[PDB]
Design a protein around this ligand. Sequence first.
Ligand SMILES: N[C@H](CCC[C@H](N)C(=O)O)C(=O)O
Ligand SMILES: N[C@H](CCC[C@H](N)C(=O)O)C(=O)O
Lengths: 280, 280
Amino acid sequence: MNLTIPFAKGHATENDFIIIPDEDARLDLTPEMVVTLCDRRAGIGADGILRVVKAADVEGSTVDPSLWFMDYRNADGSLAEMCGNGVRLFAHWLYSRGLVDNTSFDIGTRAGVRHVDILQADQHSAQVRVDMGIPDVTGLSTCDINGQVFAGLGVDMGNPHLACVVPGLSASALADMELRAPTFDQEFFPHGVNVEIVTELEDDAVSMRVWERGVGETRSCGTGTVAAACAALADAGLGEGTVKVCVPGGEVEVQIFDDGSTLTGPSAIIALGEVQIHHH
Amino acid sequence: MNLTIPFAKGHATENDFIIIPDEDARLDLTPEMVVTLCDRRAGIGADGILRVVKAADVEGSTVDPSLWFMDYRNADGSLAEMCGNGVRLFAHWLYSRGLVDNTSFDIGTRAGVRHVDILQADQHSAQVRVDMGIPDVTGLSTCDINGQVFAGLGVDMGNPHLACVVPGLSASALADMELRAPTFDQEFFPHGVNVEIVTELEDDAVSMRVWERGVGETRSCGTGTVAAACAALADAGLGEGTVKVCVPGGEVEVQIFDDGSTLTGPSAIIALGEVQIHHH
Ligand SMILES: N[C@H](CCC[C@H](N)C(=O)O)C(=O)O
Ligand SMILES: N[C@H](CCC[C@H](N)C(=O)O)C(=O)O
């Protein structure tokens, strides 16, 4: 006995999502079902899910009930407290379908409210700026990736990061290295952690790869790019700045003040349809 | 300037396809476009494409123009001469949408005509039997996978195979081994080759993994299962038989006579929609 769910597919710097419209709040998917859908072969395939729902109808939220809420699920069914690339696609979706009518608006997330600015938008593409709030640098920790250690900044962007700027690493060296789920200090990161490997600041740019909690390597990670841009700035001895972060799925521009931070990048809406899945 | 293409997503033992309806024969996709679509993040994601077209309107075919033709493309844009799992999903599609009206019919492929029998069918599931023709054992060759050599049968099933039955290998040992694109004799396989690693016959069953030409590891390979079932039977000293082949995405039953061979397995239709893609 299978359900038929309307959906759209999209990405933001090739970090890709399945959008489930759910204003009547009748598709709070179980984690098994999330897994099934984010399986490319068995389902559709994605890095995770954006279920579109009002804050009024989302369990555990206490943000303004009148806002749209970005119910993000990771590909393993795991919840997460924020998703930078997600927020951009979610904004793109809402605007482009006329579910809001300003280029500038607030969205609810599991880390609270996030403001967005639509800079450019079609049916299929957009550029979105996100107020990401203040990066809270949590301390210093390390990880091991494939019997080699790196030292990083803990950063809280809503969710946890370990941003390891690597002294001397070229971009081509970085493209080459082979990643395995890192191992980290579980007292420091009791809930798991997103890890970013980063090149040092140069021409106001860094290059990054990332091993997402819940998911594995992704072609981009928006909260992680901001984490990386802190780390790169801190390693150059600044704490304000504008940094272009280069990820396997593209480019974003992060901006860091003392009062806050922003993440500006593209978003794309690739497909619409309906999908089959089994309850059991 | 982007095209909007109606499509369906489906699989056959988790070897998954994008179905493009194209009776007016106006979507002979270029290989770049195939690649874009079979990219999960950038497009939809699949092991390959089944474009649905009449034999009349397919370049290079000389089969009966009145038949439906399975225009199969691999995920790298590469054409291929047959696709076993594809044929089952293609039959499922045609029947279930009422584009044929018999449970038993002929389909055109790049290896010529293939007969099919629909055994069970819904909107969403089916069991299909395929007349695969005669396995032609081409000789003996070897390959290397990750600095280790295996010896195999060359088999022509339409397309080329190297079926390596491995003396002593358990299923759990097989689940464990780590695969890399094999290296093979290019005089023997001037066009590339599908490689199957197989366990010895036991309880009329073998277990198999496969590194598809054009694609890489797949959860199943229908022509390869028949290749594997020959090899396993030959290594047990028979040349007729009924063999259950176990693949990471499930199970199929292959049957071998002297007059021919059949492949019976499941098929599923997971989603319908429309997708965006760029000409340039
Ligand atoms: N790709 C997302 C990250 C999702 C976070 C999730 N992987 C986690 O914290 O577990 C981003 O744009 O920020
Ligand atoms: N998965 C397909 C194999 C496609 C063959 C293609 N990989 C090639 O010959 O290059 C099958 O069911 O037989």
